[PDB]
Amino acid sequence: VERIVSRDIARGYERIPIPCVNAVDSEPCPSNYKYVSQNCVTSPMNIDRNITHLQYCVCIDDCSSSNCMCGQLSMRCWYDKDGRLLPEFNMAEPPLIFECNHACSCWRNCRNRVVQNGLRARLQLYRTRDMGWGVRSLQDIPPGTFVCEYVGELISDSEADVREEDSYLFDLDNKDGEVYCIDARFYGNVSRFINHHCEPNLVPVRVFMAHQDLRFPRIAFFSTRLIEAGEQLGFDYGERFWDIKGKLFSCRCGSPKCRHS
Template sequence: MILVENTVDLEGPPLDFYYINEYKPAPGINVINGITTGCECADCPAEKCCPKEAGFILAYNKKKKLKIQPGLPIYECNSFCRCGPDCPNRIVQKGTPYSLCIFRTNNGRGWGVKTLQKIKMNSFVMEYVGEVITSEEAERRGQFYDNQGNTYLFDLDYDSDEFTVDAARYGNVSHFVNHSCDPNLQVFNVFIDNLDLRLPRIALFSTRTIKAGEELTFDYQMKGLQILTLLLQEVWGTSRFCCSLM
């Protein structure tokens, strides 16, 4: 359930925004690569479950909470796997599990998103979706968005910089999530029915326990090499990390 709340002014939700639950690919872009096989596990995780076949560890623990570090990919079981819907390796594909509220902020930041339920640390919260476009088209749109003073472009830079997600006109609740240099959500790349490394799905997980009524935020620039930098800082024992709003 997603509510909309405005106790600040008379501004209504954007009229030119269309709500979608999955990527909307531009012509010529295929976000489903025709995968035809899945794991044979009757009870995941098993010896040859999807993450291990891809060369990575299972991303979730027995309580279905994230157990991997930022920068590592998540490989979930797909539509051809033998395991059922209760498989502990099917999390992001089930969609947002919490009741959220799109609300009008009272400090001039426009709309924001808050949770109506308590969210435990390392829990999946929402997926970032929108139009999947080429980096060339993103460059063109970016110039227009910069003139407007806002942007919803998210580079899919896990393996390359060929594609970008644009959530300006088509997206879900993540369209309204604000930036923070001290965010409570973290970005992870997810692969399910598409194993093309250029086109990961983008999932947002909680970095700590989030109280009911608290605003949800993520770092707009915490992507690609910056996630690797954060991992290195953790190894070196450096806790300070500065960022700036795009």
């Protein structure tokens, strides 16, 4: 029988509820972490938030023209009228996306704003049979759709070096020697429950919104293909995760092309 153990793990902080169900075992809704809908810090990170350091656009339309300066930073704006990534988007090597911000001349409803509008897809935390908790989609998700952000505690590489629990770490970009991490172990959103898959239906894209401090991209998962209702979400944790954890367990994604089994 399928137990509903929470109607919303996000406690109303997202646009839609994220329920938790368990049809497998006795386990209650996870509670050894704090759900947060946006990134937080403990020790200060000193993100550059000087408003005069933002690059911005001067568009007189909805930022759908060839001349949007913010699209230009992104190579071009990659969003169509439905907020979905263009078919030409390179899922194997995604560019950095610069969404419009509060310094731009455009309106808050312009085309070049997707991740900043928050989670929209109907997701569900559920108990898998042999990979603990996982996240599934409750709807069909068309290709190129923003699904969720990898949200957690922003930490330095030196702090990650002394964090014993590293199963919920996302490495950010090396910028002029400085590297940072998102640790979702103690504070995180729904993304902390997404399991690894070697042929993933999500790809992480680095996105800039309210600030443009290149040390601190935000990590937005977009669908790489049509995700069918009921499907488990997955992304590729990458080679550092498996170089460390492969000596403890092998991958159970079940792909016929699994690279970590």
